Subunit: 309 residues, 3 copies
Amino acid sequence: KPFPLPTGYFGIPLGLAALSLAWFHLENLFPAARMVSDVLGIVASAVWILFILMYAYKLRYYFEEVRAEYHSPVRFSFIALIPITTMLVGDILYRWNPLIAEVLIWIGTIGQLLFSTLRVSELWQGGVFEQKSTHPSFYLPAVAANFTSASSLALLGYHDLGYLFFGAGMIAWIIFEPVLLQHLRISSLEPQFRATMGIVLAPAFVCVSAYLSINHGEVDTLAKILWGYGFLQLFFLLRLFPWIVEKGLNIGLWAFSFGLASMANSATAFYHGNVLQGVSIFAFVFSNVMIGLLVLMTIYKLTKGQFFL
Amino acid sequence: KPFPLPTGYFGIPLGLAALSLAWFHLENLFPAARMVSDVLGIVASAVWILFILMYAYKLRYYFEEVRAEYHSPVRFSFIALIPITTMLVGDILYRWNPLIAEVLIWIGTIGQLLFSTLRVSELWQGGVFEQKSTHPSFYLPAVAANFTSASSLALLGYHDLGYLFFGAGMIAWIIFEPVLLQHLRISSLEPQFRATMGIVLAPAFVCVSAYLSINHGEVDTLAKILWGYGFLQLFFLLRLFPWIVEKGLNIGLWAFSFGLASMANSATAFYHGNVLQGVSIFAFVFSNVMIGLLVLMTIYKLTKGQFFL
Amino acid sequence: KPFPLPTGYFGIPLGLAALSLAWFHLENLFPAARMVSDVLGIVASAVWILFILMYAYKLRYYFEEVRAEYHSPVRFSFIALIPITTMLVGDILYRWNPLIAEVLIWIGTIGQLLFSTLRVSELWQGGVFEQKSTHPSFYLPAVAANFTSASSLALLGYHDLGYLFFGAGMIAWIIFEPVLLQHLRISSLEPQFRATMGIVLAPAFVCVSAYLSINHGEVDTLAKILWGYGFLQLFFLLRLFPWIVEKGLNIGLWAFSFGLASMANSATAFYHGNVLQGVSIFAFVFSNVMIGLLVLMTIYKLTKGQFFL
Ligand SMILES: CCCCCCCCO[C@@H]1O[C@H](CO)[C@@H](O)[C@H](O)[C@H]1O
Ligand SMILES: CCCCCCCCO[C@@H]1O[C@H](CO)[C@@H](O)[C@H](O)[C@H]1O
Ligand SMILES: CCCCCCCCO[C@@H]1O[C@H](CO)[C@@H](O)[C@H](O)[C@H]1O
Ligand SMILES: CCCCCCCCO[C@@H]1O[C@H](CO)[C@@H](O)[C@H](O)[C@H]1O
Ligand SMILES: CCCCCCCCO[C@@H]1O[C@H](CO)[C@@H](O)[C@H](O)[C@H]1O
Ligand SMILES: CCCCCCCCO[C@@H]1O[C@H](CO)[C@@H](O)[C@H](O)[C@H]1O
Ligand SMILES: CCCCCCCCO[C@@H]1O[C@H](CO)[C@@H](O)[C@H](O)[C@H]1O
Ligand SMILES: CCCCCCCCO[C@@H]1O[C@H](CO)[C@@H](O)[C@H](O)[C@H]1O
Ligand SMILES: CCCCCCCCO[C@@H]1O[C@H](CO)[C@@H](O)[C@H](O)[C@H]1O
Ligand SMILES: CCCCCCCCO[C@@H]1O[C@H](CO)[C@@H](O)[C@H](O)[C@H]1O
Ligand SMILES: CCCCCCCCO[C@@H]1O[C@H](CO)[C@@H](O)[C@H](O)[C@H]1O
Ligand SMILES: CCCCCCCCO[C@@H]1O[C@H](CO)[C@@H](O)[C@H](O)[C@H]1O
């Protein structure tokens, strides 16, 4: 029974793949962490394969739906999930096959850069994007895709090239967030989009995780600064959580998984660097519990014929 | 004759307490600086006690006025003056009683973080905050409170935790200022609020003062960068001063005292580091003269039954 | 046949002077680079002299046109080209006569700081600047003028003072760009102003070029970060180029020459530091070809009686 896969579902393998990598970084401190990493990584990779196959079907048989999402000044952003997750799967696979991993990383990096270059810039022509288009999802092509390239390139040994992507994402972040939070202040985000508030958790933690990958895990002043703003945003989003889910818990809450998983990844580096170890443990446990809850609610929905379109 | 204390009056002990700390930092260069520091610090602490007592009375007998200021998307910010000044008084008291100082610092830090977490985030629900709510006072809970925690925690020996607060404030600053200055460009701030333009002086100087506390007074590239933007803002506000006071000099001009006092504090570190010593001397003298003028106009108003509500 | 010189034409000597300085920095790697630098520098200096003479005539005989551009919340910005180019000519002249160079640098630095202090701040009074005034040209007095002072002061040996100007420009940039790109998203820039999109290329490259002047050419994390965002903007502007010139190629395209020339200058430092040498070569060649095309189209227009007003 054919159906067009909602692009946002790539957030599921994305969150799982990022959490696999966080656990990978604990292996030398806690050897059993590698088994947990490998299991999360295989599950994320499997889900990614499936979703890539489903999306290839969407492109072949439901192309006009993709074209409409592509030209939308709001919905285009979710497409960036595709190359982001491709890169994270490459990072996972690198532990087993660096050749295949490097192919996936380059495909994702070229694909996300071509994507942004075509669409993010086109917004600057005016008249299509409106004030009401100012959504957290914009972080995906503008910010998160660049941080993911930064960290993946560093994994491959291209640290200086990674810094270029890092810079592109960090400055893009700082340049978009002001107008986003002002818009949220003035305009009440409608319930159907509120789960995407979870993406507001992402920038500072995805940023510091990419930074720590490129700088060999040196926890310095910048990294601490980023963690500070990251936790501020976490506390804000926690207070806002009842309003976020005013209309009920739903699968869109996977939007939080990117920032959660990056908070866990960055915590491993803070722990290794003997900076705020107690905070690190808390951060790492919290993010795992929250993602575990997402998995449980996803298994629940799956067994009730919900989930898919 | 009972009366409800206007919350903004906490700006007076705030400015004096911050100026006490600036002088404290000169003691080893100029021993008489410690007497000047102690006198400013005792006066600020005394005024703070009084104002805290008056505000406790406001909470008990005029609670609905506090509730209205609290839920206002503009007036809520002045409440942040309370924990900020509590921390600065703790910093002063630390020279005499580190135990009491540490209690005040933690009360202020927890109180300001709870405050922001409850109210600054709630703004993101939309529909209450309006474009016309975009006032410089927002810096108080969003930016200045975090910088004050950063510096106070560093005083207590919690440097890495201080960096987290520093980061939260520095990034929050950069994220709010763009929309503030655009709003000021487009919308003429009404005279009754114009004294609060003085708060625009604060961010860069309060930032660098907190930075220098946490990094042991090392005047590095970041510190110089911050000073640069700080002076730009000073020059802009000086040119704007006749327009700020178009409707007359008033007590609201204490709004400038936070940035002035922080400019004096940061100047002590620049002087100790042998960076721009001539600029430092100028900055330190200027801020003291300006705060001295504020004291004189406050003594004036006090002797004319003006001042209080 | 008297005529009032359009202020924007100072962009021509500006671009050429900045490109002279980029080549100057290659002299020790490639000795023939000094001849290319000297020729570009003499041509830029000659054009500057002429344009300064023409503008002195405009001030004497067409003063009301200058007054109107000065008080315009949009057109005032182009006036900043005057002190910027004065400084860059001083930087060029320094190779032959450091005394004269230092006079020009100080005149430009004092002039641009007085200019911004008078006009950029005055915008904050509200009611004159409108949303539709949010143009890329604002970068000139707010950002580029400060970076140029930073680098020129460093040339003169005033590195710490240069850092203050650097800071003023870097933070000003970060504070304006968010509202600029949001405005471009929402409002289609009209064709007659679209050439000024070229100024969007400038900030990151002019920033890193100034940074590298003040920090003795040390290619560090900040410099790489800036280059990253710089290239992102380049790719975006390249995709947008057909829309920029939808109504035809014109002399306003000299607006791109500031970012192009700074990209070439920064590339010399990256090359000297053995960072991304291949990218550096590409950047340096690209910018030269693009500026060469501008020269060719300018010679073309000159020989067809176009060009001047
Ligand atoms: C995975 C993301 C892919 C997004 C699909 C790109 C949409 C391209 O867009 C369309 O392509 C058509 C021709 O094929 C043109 O005729 C249309 O003008 C254009 O709208
Ligand atoms: C995620 C992998 C990369 C996506 C490539 C999408 C190809 C889009 O294709 C191009 O997109 C432009 C959009 O601005 C359209 O104007 C063009 O019509 C179209 O050819
Ligand atoms: C908007 C966020 C910007 C913050 C970045 C500035 C932090 C840079 O901090 C720098 O880091 C080095 C390593 O710890 C320190 O040694 C330097 O002395 C310090 O200036
Ligand atoms: C990001 C957090 C990941 C690391 C979690 C490890 C939790 C271990 O716990 C710690 O183990 C130590 C020695 O191994 C003990 O010294 C500590 O006191 C104990 O807290
Ligand atoms: C020092 C700052 C304190 C701010 C006062 C908090 C305002 C709380 O708010 C009020 O509390 C009431 C119950 O007591 C509720 O009934 C109301 O719904 C709520 O408006
Ligand atoms: C400065 C010291 C800390 C202030 C604590 C204030 C307690 C506020 O109280 C809570 O505030 C919420 C506001 O968003 C309200 O919604 C709640 O009704 C109220 O209980
Ligand atoms: C928006 C403001 C951001 C500016 C922060 C960047 C400045 C960081 O500057 C860094 O500081 C170190 C200490 O001086 C230097 O040694 C580093 O080499 C330099 O990259
Ligand atoms: C932030 C500024 C605080 C310090 C102010 C000190 C002013 C002292 O003045 C300085 O004293 C020096 C030696 O002590 C002399 O060498 C200097 O030339 C003189 O300028
Ligand atoms: C090179 C830039 C110079 C800009 C010209 C400044 C415009 C000054 O402005 C004008 O000056 C007049 C008196 O001379 C006043 O009468 C006017 O009120 C004022 O508009
Ligand atoms: C580029 C060299 C420096 C330019 C100096 C311009 C002098 C402007 O002159 C002043 O400008 C003010 C504008 O805000 C006006 O209000 C004043 O009327 C005018 O005297
Ligand atoms: C918005 C842009 C802000 C980015 C500035 C932060 C970069 C500062 O980076 C700092 O630079 C030093 C020199 O390479 C490093 O050694 C420090 O360890 C690093 O923290
Ligand atoms: C910003 C770029 C400026 C420098 C351009 C130089 C191009 C020279 O080319 C380089 O010359 C080298 C030795 O001199 C050879 O080793 C290289 O392989 C070759 O690429």
